[PDB]
Design a protein around this ligand. Structure first.
Ligand SMILES: [Mg+2]
Ligand SMILES: [Mg+2]
Ligand SMILES: [Mg+2]
Ligand SMILES: [Mg+2]
Ligand SMILES: [Mg+2]
Ligand SMILES: [Mg+2]
Ligand SMILES: [Mg+2]
Ligand SMILES: [Mg+2]
Ligand SMILES: [Mg+2]
Ligand SMILES: [Mg+2]
Ligand SMILES: [Mg+2]
Ligand SMILES: [Mg+2]
Ligand SMILES: [Mg+2]
Ligand SMILES: [Mg+2]
Ligand SMILES: [Mg+2]
Ligand SMILES: [Mg+2]
Ligand SMILES: [Mg+2]
Ligand SMILES: [Mg+2]
Ligand SMILES: [Mg+2]
Ligand SMILES: [Mg+2]
Ligand SMILES: [Mg+2]
Ligand SMILES: [Mg+2]
Ligand SMILES: [Mg+2]
Ligand SMILES: [Mg+2]
Ligand SMILES: [Mg+2]
Ligand SMILES: [Mg+2]
Ligand SMILES: [Mg+2]
Ligand SMILES: [Mg+2]
Ligand SMILES: [Mg+2]
Ligand SMILES: [Mg+2]
Ligand SMILES: [Mg+2]
Ligand SMILES: [Mg+2]
Ligand SMILES: [Mg+2]
Ligand SMILES: [Mg+2]
Ligand SMILES: [Mg+2]
Ligand SMILES: [Mg+2]
Ligand SMILES: [Mg+2]
Ligand SMILES: [Mg+2]
Ligand SMILES: [Mg+2]
Ligand SMILES: [Mg+2]
Ligand SMILES: [Mg+2]
Ligand SMILES: [Mg+2]
Ligand SMILES: [Mg+2]
Ligand SMILES: [Mg+2]
Ligand SMILES: [Mg+2]
Ligand SMILES: [Mg+2]
Ligand SMILES: [Mg+2]
Ligand SMILES: [Mg+2]
Ligand SMILES: [Mg+2]
Ligand SMILES: [Mg+2]
Ligand SMILES: [Mg+2]
Lengths: 58, 169, 211, 296, 159, 145
RNA sequence: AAGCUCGUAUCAGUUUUAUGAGGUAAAGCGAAUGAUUAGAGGUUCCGGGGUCGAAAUGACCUUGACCUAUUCUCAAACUUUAAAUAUGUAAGAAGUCCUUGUUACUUAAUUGAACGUGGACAUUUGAAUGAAGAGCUUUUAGUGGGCCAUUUUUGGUAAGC
RNA sequence: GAGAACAGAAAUCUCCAGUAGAACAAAAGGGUAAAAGCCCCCUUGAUUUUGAUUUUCAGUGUGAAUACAAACCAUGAAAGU
RNA sequence: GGUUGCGGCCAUAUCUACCAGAAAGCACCGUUUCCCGUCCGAUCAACUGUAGUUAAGCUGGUAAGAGCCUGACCGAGUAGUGUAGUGGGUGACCAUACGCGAAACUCAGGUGCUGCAAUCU
């Protein structure tokens, strides 16, 4: 009862039907795992500049 | 050419290889103490020989390094014991030299049956000024050729001051 | 118990040396590679004849050793033991395995069986030096050794001066100049590179020009 | 060298030479690595060091930062500037170390603006203290001690430098246990001692004691002190006055020079051997297989 | 049985370059990285900490995070029939600024020049790149250069 | 395979023009076993277009047959007749991309003389049929057109 | 299968250009590790024999090893060098340059860092070729014994293994 | 390698050469020289919280590991680690 | 140009043997009250810059030098290789077609360049 053990045969045929999807790319990617000290500050910085545009619409 | 490639003695190292720990060693130690006035240093065995009866790290031998005037005395002193005759060997090609004597008593020092009799290895190492280069921390370097102690240079040196002999071929 | 040579003629395997990974491999059946007057000086024996492979195959320690004897036996009994210098140019460094035989094809890694030299097209197998006044004897000797080997080899008259890498003229030119100097059974050549001082030591007989 | 020593081409061919500045035994790269490199998120922020070197009796103090083209001196002071402030002798002692470092802090601090705010300690009872930050105002100028290859013994004068650069105003982070007057068997500094050194009190007491016990030696070394008439007691006032001088004007005067760069150049090439041409070299050899070959 | 640990098959990969062992020169440490930068990745075997996995060797990605001793690089790795985003935490010893961008960045500045430069004169630019064109005609003289005639050569042994 | 597609050759005996640069030269290199090519003369470019020349128009493979078809689709680039089209191709003018993409791949028959060879799938140079056969391409194409 | 959001658009089992990574093939071995044939010249207060010896840290042969410069031959688990084929990223509007706002992060510092306001430049806007368009979402079948050919290739004498 | 009484092939002493030919528990391979090896000094970061990441991958788990945040400490003159 | 302190690239910088170095610098060099470390003030610490020296370090030059670096239609379009054929050959293997293309070899040319700060006939 032995059998084939392993093969890549036909696997790239398969990968290429639907395609090897190029990575897809966004403006504004996530900050996932970016330095928390930085982010904490970056948060208040943004709060700040936003305020100063609401302010510039007085 | 010579201004101060004068040939000082770097150091004298007296060494008693007492192949065993315990009293007989601490006595050989006591000898080297009172001989140098310096508190002497102990050596452990490198490995085990068993037909020398020694074990690794046993404390097997004492020695002591002595520098300046104090060194010239002891040298000269033991040099007498050797009737001021060495051999054409004894003088390494790097220019140092040594001898042995049995019985330390042949150089001042009384007998005392509680300390016994010990053999001694004398080893004089020669150098010149500006040797600090090789030994100092920063910009450690190597003494230029025509400034290195050699056998010839040291034999003639030895043969002159002291007025001793060299013997053999 | 020697399998027929037929079984290992071809190079089907990456080379399997004797190694810390191998270890228990039988001694090579050939063990002298230099026969005849091998002490002989380079000027002594100018003619070089080669035995040259025409196949990518494998030669056994055994077939080298047999061939060695055959060529050397012929050569000395026809022209004397100091007439030539025989050199086996090929060492049997490749171990052959054997699956000697409860089990079956399970776990079939073989044990060392014997040794072989792996050999190219145009690879030199035997080399011989003599005096031109001996070509045919030498040649005939290599011809008789051929029958000891699988696959086609063909004998080839050299252009070089004995075991040297120089053509006869170029060697003569280097010699009847100053540039050559004797050594064991080979030779040493003056270089224009290196210390001038101890280049004159060796090769005193150079550093002139004329006669 | 010895014959059975001596190098094979194989040895030499595979040899990997250390960094030049190690072969010279002048730079510890392990230390430098950890001194120079900066938080990667503090970006182009230089990491200044207070380099302190001793030559056979000149003290060198520079404030240096790094650049991959090479380092950058912000400022430098040498103890050979100390005659300008009323110190002519002993330009390598522990207090010439302090003075020079004080000079270096005052100088840079000045040329930076922090001259006024952050004066450091003007009183100087040699108390242990590094310079605190002005409430609402610039943080102090921060600098890290580059000992170089110096051993860190407690009493080393490389820390004398450190003391007066810190007493000067700089923030040079440091603990107290390599200052003279640190008691081994109690985590505690006597500052009566450390003050004494800052003002050269050990050198003076040496002078006082040598006076009435051996004037043979007292005249050999301390020659200058006799020759310019300065018996001990004054030494503290000398350096105390020096200190004050320095704060009054650390702004570094360069030497009047005399002779141009071009000039020093000229007379120095008079003494510089010049490499030969390969044509020339071929006619030393040809010349050599004339004589050494052509039979005398 | 089989073996597939972290640094497996990496014998020569993480090796150190002939006569280039030891300390890493300080310039490696003086270089600066900013989020958005492009870096090439290559492991320094002498720096075991913060080391890329072998897969990422010779791979180029963008910096997304700047930390005390390291940068975070995102790499798009393809698994199955698709790419997934991967974020690496590399120490600065295993990364260098990529030049894959200079022939562009240097070309952009250049483009801006001859764009404004020309325009001011009175246009006619053409600043897209173009492939190796074929050769135009040309006349070759014979003066001092009559054609040498060669033939093939007979077979021969020299050996 | 991908290259034959990019060159628009997805069926036997079809054909298209290719402007030669290093960036296409290497495409030609990669398909030598499966194509024949060469340098067409005016006569055969003229007769390719006159006889089997179709534009692509909202896809829809449309026969040339009248000049208004050409001008409606390529007039933008100059080019407002069939012989304009040809002139753009043969001189490899400034708008060769647009002009040449406009032409559908030519659909040819088997050569009428035959192939001149016992076996097609060796290079022209070895008495076979593929590769650059330079000006000998015209005799082929004509026999296939 | 159902579609859905869009549409010149964004797309690519391809090339080009630029910039990386790699240690295979070849090659190498008078280059390192490891193997391997041959001599030649050296070196011993020091490996053994032997002649002279009262001995010698004596002399003379001798055979060993070691050393120097050479010589024939090799490596899947050797290597300085090092391909071809494969392989990462890049070729812009999510771009480039100017001015100077926000923060609690960070700097000696209104220094930087990050995100921004305001301003300047358009289809030769930034290589080729192609694009019966592109993107996206759900749900579900069968399958989960494979076999063959060229080339690379392991075990095996070999096999339609 | 060349030197020093007993001391010999091997004990302990000194100088010279020395790219690592050593050593780093262990298999092997990588790595390392003012060190990652050897000697000494001070220690408990082998700790506390809970996330992100790489390998194996289904991009589940487990194992192992990486770079940060928030504590409390250690060591060092210090940058640091 | 020299020299120094801190450097970058890390042998065109290393290695062997000789010779040359003005001025400053560096250095070797003297001392042991003090802090400090040693079996030994040799290293390490301090003190003098006074008492002495270019001997060494250092820098530079020499060498049909060892090494290293660079180049070249030197070898070699060779080895190897991507692609093709109902090509040759019993086979082992080999030639041809469209491309890519080494390493050794050999010969020639080299032997640190350079940043910041101070200093100097
Ligand atoms: Mg089963
Ligand atoms: Mg089966
Ligand atoms: Mg199965
Ligand atoms: Mg002198
Ligand atoms: Mg005993
Ligand atoms: Mg120096
Ligand atoms: Mg094969
Ligand atoms: Mg096999
Ligand atoms: Mg069986
Ligand atoms: Mg059975
Ligand atoms: Mg088994
Ligand atoms: Mg087994
Ligand atoms: Mg081979
Ligand atoms: Mg035969
Ligand atoms: Mg040869
Ligand atoms: Mg040697
Ligand atoms: Mg050699
Ligand atoms: Mg090193
Ligand atoms: Mg340190
Ligand atoms: Mg395995
Ligand atoms: Mg760890
Ligand atoms: Mg087309
Ligand atoms: Mg017809
Ligand atoms: Mg017909
Ligand atoms: Mg007809
Ligand atoms: Mg037919
Ligand atoms: Mg027809
Ligand atoms: Mg491999
Ligand atoms: Mg290999
Ligand atoms: Mg091979
Ligand atoms: Mg090679
Ligand atoms: Mg070898
Ligand atoms: Mg590609
Ligand atoms: Mg199109
Ligand atoms: Mg469409
Ligand atoms: Mg399904
Ligand atoms: Mg399913
Ligand atoms: Mg299923
Ligand atoms: Mg290991
Ligand atoms: Mg270090
Ligand atoms: Mg634990
Ligand atoms: Mg699970
Ligand atoms: Mg996991
Ligand atoms: Mg002078
Ligand atoms: Mg001293
Ligand atoms: Mg000192
Ligand atoms: Mg001199
Ligand atoms: Mg040379
Ligand atoms: Mg091929
Ligand atoms: Mg075939
Ligand atoms: Mg061939």
């Amino acid at each position: 009862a032995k059998s084939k053990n392993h093969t890549a045969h036909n696997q790239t045929r398969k990968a290429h039907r639907n395609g090897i999807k190029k990575p897809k790319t966004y403006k504004y990617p996530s900050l996932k795992g970016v330095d928390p000290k930085f982010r904490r500050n970056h948060k208040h910085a943004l709060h700040g500049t936003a305020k100063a545009l609401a302010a510039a619409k007085k | 050419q010579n201004p101060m490639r004068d040939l000082k003695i770097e150091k004298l190292v007296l060494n008693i290889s007492v192949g065993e720990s315990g009293d007989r060693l601490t006595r050989a130690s006591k000898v080297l103490e009172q001989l140098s006035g310096q508190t002497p240093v102990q050596s452990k065995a490198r490995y085990t020989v068993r037909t020398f009866g020694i074990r690794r790290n046993e404390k097997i031998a004492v020695h002591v390094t002595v520098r300046g005037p104090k060194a010239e005395e002891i040298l000269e002193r033991g040099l007498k014991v050797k009737e001021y005759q060495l051999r054409d060997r004894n003088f390494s090609a790097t220019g140092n030299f040594g001898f042995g004597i049995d019985e330390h008593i042949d150089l001042g020092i009384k007998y005392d049956p509680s300390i016994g009799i010990f053999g001694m290895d004398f080893y004089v190492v020669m150098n010149r000024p500006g040797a600090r280069v090789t030994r100092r921390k920063r910009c450690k370097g190597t003494v230029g050729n025509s400034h290195k102690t050699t056998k010839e240079d040291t034999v003639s040196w030895f043969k002159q001051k002291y007025d001793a002999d060299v013997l053999d071929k | 118990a020697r399998r027929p040579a037929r079984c290992y003629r071809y190079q089907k395997n990456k080379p399997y040396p004797k190694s810390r990974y191998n270890r228990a491999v039988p001694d090579s059946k050939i063990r002298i590679y230099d026969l005849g007057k091998k002490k002989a000086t380079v000027d002594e024996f100018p003619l070089c004849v080669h035995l040259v492979s025409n196949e990518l195959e494998q030669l056994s320690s055994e077939a080298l050793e047999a061939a060695r004897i055959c060529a050397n036996k012929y050569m000395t009994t026809v022209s004397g033991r100091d007439a030539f210098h025989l050199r086996v140019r090929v060492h049997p460094f490749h171990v052959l395995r054997i699956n000697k035989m409860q089990q079956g094809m399970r776990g079939a890694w073989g044990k060392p069986h014997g040794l072989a030299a792996r050999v190219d097209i145009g690879q030199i197998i035997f080399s011989v030096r003599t005096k031109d006044s001996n070509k045919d004897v030498v040649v005939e000797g290599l011809r008789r050794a051929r029958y000891k080997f699988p696959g086609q080899q063909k004998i080839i008259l050299s252009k070089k001066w004995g075991f040297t890498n120089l053509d006869r003229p170029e060697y003569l030119k280097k010699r009847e100049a100053g540039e050559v100097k004797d050594d064991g059974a080979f030779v040493k050549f003056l270089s224009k590179k290196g210390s001038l001082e101890n280049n004159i030591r060796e090769f005193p007989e150079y550093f002139a020009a004329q006669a | 060298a010895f014959q059975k020593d001596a190098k094979s081409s194989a040895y030499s061919s595979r040899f990997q030479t250390p960094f030049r500045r190690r072969r010279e035994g002048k730079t510890d790269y392990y230390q430098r690595k950890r001194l120079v490199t900066q938080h990667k998120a503090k970006y182009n922020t230089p990491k200044y060091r207070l380099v302190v070197r001793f030559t056979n009796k000149d003290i060198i103090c520079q404030i240096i930062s790094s650049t991959i083209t090479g380092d950058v001196v912000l400022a430098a002071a040498y103890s050979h500037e100390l005659p300008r402030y009323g110190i002519t002798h002993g330009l390598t002692n522990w207090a010439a170390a302090y003075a020079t470092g004080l000079l270096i802090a005052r100088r840079t601090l000045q040329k930076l603006g922090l001259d006024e705010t952050y004066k450091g300690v003007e009183e100087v009872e040699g108390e242990y203290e590094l310079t605190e930050a002005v409430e609402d105002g610039p943080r102090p100028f921060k600098v890290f001690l580059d000992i170089g290859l110096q051993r860190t013994t407690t009493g080393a004068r490389v820390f004398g430098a450190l003391k007066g650069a810190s007493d000067g105003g700089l923030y040079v982070p440091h603990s107290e246990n390599r200052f003279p007057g640190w008691d081994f068997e109690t985590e505690e500094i006597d500052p009566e001692l450390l003050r004494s050194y800052i003002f050269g009190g050990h050198v003076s007491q040496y002078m006082e004691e040598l006076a009435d016990d051996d004037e043979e030696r007292f005249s050999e070394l301390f020659k200058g002190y006799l020759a310019d008439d300065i018996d001990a007691d004054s030494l503290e006032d000398i350096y105390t006055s020096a200190h004050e001088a320095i704060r009054a004007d650390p702004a570094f005067k360069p030497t009047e020079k005399k002779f141009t760069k071009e000039q020093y150049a000229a007379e120095s090439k008079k003494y510089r051997q010049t490499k030969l041409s390969k044509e020339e070299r071929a006619a030393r050899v040809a010349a050599k297989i004339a004589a050494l070959a052509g039979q005398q | 049985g089989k073996s597939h640990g972290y640094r497996s098959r990496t014998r020569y990969m993480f090796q150190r370059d002939f006569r280039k062992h030891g300390a890493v020169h300080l310039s490696t440490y003086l270089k600066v990285y900013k989020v958005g930068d492009i870096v090439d990745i290559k492991a320094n075997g002498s720096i075991q900490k913060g080391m890329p996995h072998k897969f990422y060797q010779g791979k180029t990605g963008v910096v997304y995070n700047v930390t005390k001793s390291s940068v975070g690089v995102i790499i798009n790795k393809m698994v199955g029939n698709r790419y997934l985003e991967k974020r690496l935490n590399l120490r600065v010893e295993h990364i260098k600024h990529s030049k894959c961008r200079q022939e562009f960045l240097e070309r952009v500045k250049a483009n801006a020049a001859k764009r404004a430069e020309a325009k001011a004169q009175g246009v006619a630019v053409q600043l897209k790149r173009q492939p190796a064109q074929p050769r135009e005609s040309r006349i070759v003289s014979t003066e001092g250069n009559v054609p040498q005639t060669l033939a093939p050569v007979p077979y021969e042994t020299f050996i | 395979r991908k290259v034959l597609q990019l060159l628009r050759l997805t069926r036997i005996n079809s054909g298209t023009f290719v402007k030669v640069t290093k960036a296409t030269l290497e495409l030609l290199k990669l398909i030598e076993p499966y194509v024949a090519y060469g340098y067409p003369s005016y006569s055969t470019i003229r007769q390719l277009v006159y006889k089997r020349g179709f534009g692509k128009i909202n896809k829809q493979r449309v026969p040339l047959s009248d000049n208004a078809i050409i001008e409606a689709n390529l007039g933008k680039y100059g080019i407002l007749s069939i012989d304009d089209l040809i002139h753009e191709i043969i001189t490899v003018g400034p708008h060769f991309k647009q002009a040449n993409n406009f032409l559908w791949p030519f659909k040819l028959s088997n050569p009428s003389g035959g192939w001149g060879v016992p076996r097609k799938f060796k290079h022209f140079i070895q008495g076979g049929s593929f590769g650059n056969r330079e000006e000998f391409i015209n005799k082929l194409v004509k026999s296939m057109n």
